[PDB]
């Protein structure tokens, strides 16, 4: 009854769709789109004297900043490295009342953040979250989905890198290589700060979401072996960060390490 609808209905919305794209990719559609772009640039030039007033420039200096990267957006690799070297050039230039009163007492997150503050006297939640959003997570995810092992050699620990190498060995036996892109990453945030050992090693937990496409190409012919150019799929990533007390003078890593990497 109702279960037979989804086979019949979903095709009928599709058959009228491409004709609509045939409507959109026609000469009238292309002419209207190009005239809309031309009059959009015309309106941009007409309201450019409105935008070039210095009071609007001052209020845009008040409003606009890098916090737009909070709301999404993907960074190209050349722009990401330019931002990294720009920041390097800038820097180098019975509920008892005691349970109620223990709100100011020391917790385990206080121990973790005190340890990471003792290691470096510039660490804070906002500064590390900014550095995590702008450099670390796009680099890790792009090197993850593009199959580059030299970038992931420095960041991962022994166990997730060994798991990733055993994963890529089968694809090497599959005579295919991985291609893909990362379209947008949003919600890069620190979930919780725990101690995960009997030895009390401090760790941090990072979560994010992204839009990705996974496909595999033949290294000889180049045809599609898996995946599709359409079907943009959404994923979430959960990482566990920690810091080495040594090798903090090593750049391009800054002493950080990833223990576990879970894709959901």
């Amino acid at each position, epitope marked *: 009854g109702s279960t037979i609808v989804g086979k019949t209905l979903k095709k009928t919305g599709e058959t009228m769709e491409h004709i609509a794209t045939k409507a959109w990719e026609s000469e009238l559609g292309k002419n209207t789109r190009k005239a809309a772009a031309a009059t959009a640039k015309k309106l941009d030039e007409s309201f450019e004297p409105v935008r070039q007033t210095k009071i609007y420039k001052e209020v845009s200096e008040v409003i606009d900043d890098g916090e737009s990267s909070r709301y999404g957006g993907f960074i190209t690799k050349e722009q990401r490295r330019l931002k990294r070297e720009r920041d390097l050039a800038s820097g180098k230039r019975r509920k008892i009342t005691n349970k109620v009163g223990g709100f100011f007492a020391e917790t385990e997150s206080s121990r973790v953040y005190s340890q990471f503050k003792l290691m470096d006297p510039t660490f804070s939640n906002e500064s590390f979250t900014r550095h995590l959003r702008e450099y670390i997570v796009p680099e890790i995810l792009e090197a993850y989905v593009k199959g580059d092992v030299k970038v992931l050699k420095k960041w991962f*620990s022994e166990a997730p890198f060994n798991v990733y190498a055993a994963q890529q060995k089968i694809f090497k036996e599959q005579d295919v290589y991985a291609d893909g892109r990362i379209l947008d990453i949003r919600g890069v945030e620190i979930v919780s700060a725990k*101690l995960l050992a009997p*030895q*009390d090693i401090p760790v941090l937990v990072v979560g994010c979401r992204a839009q990705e496409i996974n496909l595999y190409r033949k290294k000889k012919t180049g045809e599609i072996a898996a995946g599709d150019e359409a079907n943009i799929l959404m994923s979430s990533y959960a990482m566990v960060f*920690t810091r080495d*007390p040594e090798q903090i003078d090593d750049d391009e890593t800054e002493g950080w*390490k990833i*223990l576990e990497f879970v894709r959901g």
Partner: antibody, heavy 117, light 111 residues
Framework: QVQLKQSGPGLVQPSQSLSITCTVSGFSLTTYGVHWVRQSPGKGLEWLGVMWRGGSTDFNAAFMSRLSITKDNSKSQVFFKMNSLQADDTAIYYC???????????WGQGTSVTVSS | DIVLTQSPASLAVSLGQRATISCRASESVDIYGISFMNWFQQKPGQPPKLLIYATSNQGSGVPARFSGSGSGTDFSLNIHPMEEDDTAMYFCQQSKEVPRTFGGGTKLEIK
């Protein structure tokens, strides 16, 4: 500030029970643990047992037969109990707090336990 | 489990000179790229005091003239200026496996 103190039971008879109380101050026993370490002069330091952060306990394999470690968060106390004492256990007994990376930073006064008659 | 060994069982140095203590392990105490070995100092009538934890971090309030390094199975502790009140007994303690254990002992005096 952070300070640990101990009881003083000593000069006990052989094959008797020993009970030591470590009273902590400056922290809470549910967010820090306690190691128990003895130091005999003839056998060096050795490790008896721990009470973890999570509330579980652990002991050494050679002393698992007679060790007992319990806690009390309300009175901020840790109790140590050895059921049997012999002449080879004349030593000094310490309780120590362990913090980050399992480091025994803050140590108690330590009690001198002697076995004789 | 992990039997440790301290090399200079008897050591005597002059004032202001560098003293080096070597601690060796049976196996590797490395976990997640970090070595879990700590250093302890005991005065003749005191409980022991922590000096170095996780082989590269100073203890709380410890002066900077105590340093520690090494990895794998071999670790070392260095005091480059020798002061007259640093006459004690020194231990190294591992913190990886469940049967925790301590080193032998090192006597350090001044000629």
């Amino acid at each position: 500030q952070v300070q640990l103190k101990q009881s003083g039971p000593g000069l006990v008879q052989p094959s008797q029970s020993l009970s030591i109380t470590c009273t902590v101050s400056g922290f809470s026993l549910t967010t820090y643990g306690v190691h128990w370490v003895r130091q005999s002069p003839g056998k060096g330091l050795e490790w008896l047992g721990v009470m973890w952060r999570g509330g579980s306990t652990d002991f050494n394999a050679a002393f698992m037969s007679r060790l007992s470690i319990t806690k009390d968060n309300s009175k901020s106390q840790v109790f140590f109990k050895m059921n049997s004492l012999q002449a080879d256990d004349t030593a000094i007994y310490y309780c120590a707090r362990y913090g980050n990376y399992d480091a025994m930073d803050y140590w108690g006064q330590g009690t001198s336990v002697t076995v004789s008659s | 489990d992990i039997v440790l060994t301290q090399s200079p069982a008897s050591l005597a140095v002059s004032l202001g000179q560098r003293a080096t203590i070597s601690c060796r392990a049976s196996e590797s105490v490395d976990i997640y790229g970090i070595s879990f070995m700590n250093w302890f100092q005991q005065k003749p009538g005191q409980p022991p005091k922590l000096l170095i934890y996780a082989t590269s971090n100073q203890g709380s309030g410890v002066p900077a003239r105590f340093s520690g390094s090494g990895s794998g199975t071999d670790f070392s502790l260095n005091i480059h200026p020798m002061e007259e009140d640093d006459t004690a007994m020194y231990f190294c303690q591992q913190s990886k496996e469940v049967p925790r254990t301590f080193g032998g002992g090192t006597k350090l005096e001044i000629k």
